[PDB]
């Protein structure tokens, strides 16, 4: 029986993780948990799973303790902030860490888990997009089991030769691999015209037709910046250069991604769209874990389609590939700019079409440099956020 | 550099094997080869690949030597019959045996290769359908590397957990597997009406829309007895009971077959329809072998469809499942009946619709018994051939 620390338990990924862990209390206990604003959901979670430690930002500690007071919930240690996130992500008594915080805020805890040699289920893709080879080299230097939860990357992991982890990291495919096809749903506005793209509303962006998710990844999916981020993520996780990864639009989102081989083989992972599958896989790897996700029924889902992405209508993809080829702090700049642009759009301060625009501007305005350390990364991230906020405010 | 004995080199599989081996003369040399009627094609093959030994039936030896005389081809040992087939399939100097003979005639050589502990590339599916657990137990008892060449079974092999070979053979899936989906093109007459089914001609049966193959497997594909045989084959190769294998019609024949997992995962192998891919895989496993098969392009092959087989319109499928559940000598009876029924149809002695009919009759007429030995199997095969020939002759 292994202990789990869930970072961002109240979110979409956190809740799918809770489902799986609740089906297997004999294999997994919950030791630590973190939330950022959904405090009463967190209290109910605490009742059901009785963690030893919980974390919230400082400006919520009070509101949480008062709640714990009502339910007469005692015995739960309460820590605050990024510092509590790191402490629980690298805790002596934790065995597995689900990194399900959203965006850059998850970088320090996640990396911490990596440096403590935990089994790290990487859902927070932004952390890897920011830290790249630092996080990967740290996983290797501390024997951290860094397993992908992002559905495409889990699909690729499952479609690679089984010991691909221990292969020569050279940027070049290995062991017969020749290409990776990174599937994409194309977002809810795949077939929208530029006219309606210009006037998309937040509610529309957030309603994904296949996956029920948080707002940030919903928008990124509508915008195809999610797929840009996932291209960067795949390049780091599997240590491959970007021009070996090909994006494929697949509206049904039943095939999750593909690996192609030098003998003409293409291996795939597919299934009903339910993050519980890849969560269970990463959690139990190398063992398979029973879940309640129904078996894929191809008589009901009897058609699958594919097509090339429209990188003129969704320029975020070429921006991400850009950052990747540039390397260094380019993915960090991109990620920070996109974070505050998505934020500004969700707050109806900017139009949908403007989201990539601010990203591009930031990337053209702020200059790149080597990703030498986490300090440098956080620094460049702050500066990119500033540049992007300024550009925004100058367009209304 | 390893030596290869190709059984049935002149056929479709034999020629794809020749393509691959010709691209890699530094890794593979051809030591032995066999043909049954295409003698001058065989002589040209001998020129190009210079085997040490060739085999043909006795009633062709003369015709071959005369040919060798013309070209002044010497140094090639000539053996005759099933006995020469066994001798070359188990030869001290052979390392790999491609079992690409068609039908029951390939049983003794193939099994021989298995008993000599060679790496056996199993294309001749009839041999396994006949001999089942005898052949599998012999592969295990002699450490024969028995690798599937049949495209669906190669796809499944690639989609299983990687050490599935060493798992507990119990008829029950293992290591998280929950189902196998055995894809089927549905044949050229998938959407034909019973009226036109009744008057299908041999030329029509033989023209497969995806794969260029021999006549027997072409007919079996039109008839869906190929898929019956492949259900039996899968059950033996992966040691699973039949009710875990689900047939899926997939007209584009781009997905080759699938394995489903208890976490909701489905793993797949897909690619352009070219037997060179699975041949190369089985030949080089566990290493990947470069081939000239073009990479699968999902922008060109941009649609995939699936549907349930019509086992009322193609009753050969339920007949095969029948034989499998019955066990013992039931697959042998089925296979022999189908062999001479397909033969009679190709010789315009019977109508297409009659093919399964004779099979069924034979299975109802001849009684089952345990598959105790190869002797018993050959015996029951002869008796089934006799029963089927009699039934045929009694319908014109
Ligand atoms: N949801 C999905 O299906 C998929 C998501 N992912 C990745 O998983 C990560 C989270 O996904 P998702 O569940 O959709 O997002 P959510 O918004 O639903 O959840 C985010 C979680 O992080 C916490 N959080 C939010 N902001 C902060 C902050 N400054 N500091 C600390 N914690 C914070 C939230 O707490 P609270 O709820 O209390 O505000 C919440 O627990 C993301 O990186 C996403 O890209 C990957 C592929 C699939
Ligand atoms: N072709 C394909 O794409 C696929 C075929 N397979 C399997 O591979 C096997 C052969 O396939 P295929 O190439 O299509 O069939 P073919 O008819 O094209 O070739 C059969 C081979 O076996 C030889 N042969 C035929 N009859 C006899 C006999 N009594 N005794 C000894 N040898 C004989 C042929 O010699 P000759 O040419 O001189 O007459 C020929 O070399 C079959 O079991 C088939 O089911 C599996 C899946 C794909
Ligand atoms: C399930 C998953 O892994 N996602 O990243 C959700 C978005 C899928 P897409 O970006 O719309 O293809
Ligand atoms: C390529 C292969 O493995 N075959 O058995 C050919 C027939 C394919 P189907 O039986 O028509 O699906
Ligand atoms: Mg994803
Ligand atoms: Mg086949």
Automatic annotation (TrEMBL), chains A, B:
1-deoxy-D-xylulose 5-phosphate binds at residues 125, 151-152, 185, 208, 221, 226-227, 230. NADPH binds at residues 10-13, 124, 126, 214. Residues 146-238 form the 1-deoxy-D-xylulose 5-phosphate reductoisomerase C-terminal domain. Residues 4-132 form the 1-deoxy-D-xylulose 5-phosphate reductoisomerase N-terminal domain. It holds the Pfam family DXP_reductoisom. InterPro entries: DXP_reductoisomerase, DXP_reductoisomerase_C, DXP_reductoisomerase_N, DXPR_C, DXPR_C_sf, NAD(P)-bd_dom_sf. Its EC number is 1.1.1.267. GO terms for molecular function: 1-deoxy-D-xylulose-5-phosphate reductoisomerase activity; isomerase activity; manganese ion binding; NADPH binding. It comes from the Bacteria. Mn(2+) binds at residues 150, 152, 230. Its cofactor is Mg(2+); Mn(2+). Keywords: Isomerase, Isoprene biosynthesis, Magnesium, Manganese, Metal-binding, NADP, Oxidoreductase. It catalyses: 2-C-methyl-D-erythritol 4-phosphate + NADP(+) = 1-deoxy-D-xylulose 5-phosphate + NADPH + H(+). Pathway: Isoprenoid biosynthesis; isopentenyl diphosphate biosynthesis via DXP pathway; isopentenyl diphosphate from 1-deoxy-D-xylulose 5-phosphate: step 1/6. Signal peptide: none annotated. One of its GO terms (biological process) is isopentenyl diphosphate biosynthetic process, methylerythritol 4-phosphate pathway involved in terpenoid biosynthetic process. Residues 270-386 form the DXP reductoisomerase C-terminal domain. Belongs to the DXR family. PANTHER family: 1-DEOXY-D-XYLULOSE 5-PHOSPHATE REDUCTOISOMERASE (PTHR30525), 1-DEOXY-D-XYLULOSE 5-PHOSPHATE REDUCTOISOMERASE, CHLOROPLASTIC (PTHR30525:SF0). Catalyzes the NADPH-dependent rearrangement and reduction of 1-deoxy-D-xylulose-5-phosphate (DXP) to 2-C-methyl-D-erythritol 4-phosphate (MEP). This is 1-deoxy-D-xylulose 5-phosphate reductoisomerase. It comes from Acinetobacter baumannii. The gene is dxr.
């Amino acid at each position: 029986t292994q202990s789990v620390c869930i970072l961002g338990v109240t979110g979409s990924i956190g809740r799918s993780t809770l489902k799986i862990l609740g089906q297997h209390p004999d294999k997994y206990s919950v030791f630590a948990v973190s939330a950022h604003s959904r405090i009463s959901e967190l209290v109910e979670i605490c009742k059901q799973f009785r963690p030893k430690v919980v974390v919230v930002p400082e400006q919520k500690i009070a509101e949480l303790k008062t709640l714990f007071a009502q339910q007469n919930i005692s015995d739960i240690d309460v820590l605050a902030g990024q510092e509590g996130l790191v402490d629980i992500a690298s805790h002596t008594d934790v065995d597995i860490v689900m990194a399900a915080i959203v965006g850059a805020a998850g970088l320090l805890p996640t990396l911490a888990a990596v440096k403590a040699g935990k089994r790290v289920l990487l859902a927070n893709k932004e952390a890897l997009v920011m830290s790249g080879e630092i996080m990967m080299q740290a996983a290797r230097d501390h024997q951290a089991l860094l397993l992908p939860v992002d559905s495409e990357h889990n699909a690729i992991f499952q479609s690679l030769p089984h010991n691909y982890l221990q292969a020569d990291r050279t940027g070049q495919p290995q062991l017969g691999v020749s290409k990776i096809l990174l599937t994409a749903s194309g977002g809810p506005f795949l077939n929208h015209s530029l006219e309606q793209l210009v006037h998309v509303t937040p509610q529309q962006a957030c309603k994904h037709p296949n996956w029920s998710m948080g707002q940030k990844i919903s928008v990124d999916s509508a915008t195809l910046m999610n797929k840009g981020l996932e291209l960067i993520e795949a390049c780091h996780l599997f240590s491959i250069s970007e021009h070996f990864v090909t994006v494929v639009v697949h509206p049904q989102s039943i095939i999750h991604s593909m690996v192609q081989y030098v003998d003409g083989s293409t291996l795939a992972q597919m299934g009903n769209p339910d993050m519980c599958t890849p969560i269970a896989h990463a959690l139990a790897w190398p063992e398979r874990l029973q879940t309640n996700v129904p078996a894929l029924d191809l008589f009901e889902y009897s058609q699958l389609n594919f097509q090339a992405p429209d990188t003129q209508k969704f320029p975020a993809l070429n921006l991400a590939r850009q950052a990747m080829r540039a390397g260094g702090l380019a993915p960090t700049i991109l990620n920070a700019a996109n974070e505050i642009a998505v934020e500004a759009f969700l707050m109806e301060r900017i139009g949908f079409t403007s989201i990539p625009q601010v990203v591009e501007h930031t990337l053209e305005k702020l200059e790149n440099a080597a990703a030498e350390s986490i300090e440098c990364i956080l620094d460049k991230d702050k500066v990119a956020r500033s540049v992007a906020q300024q550009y925004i405010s100058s367009i209304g």
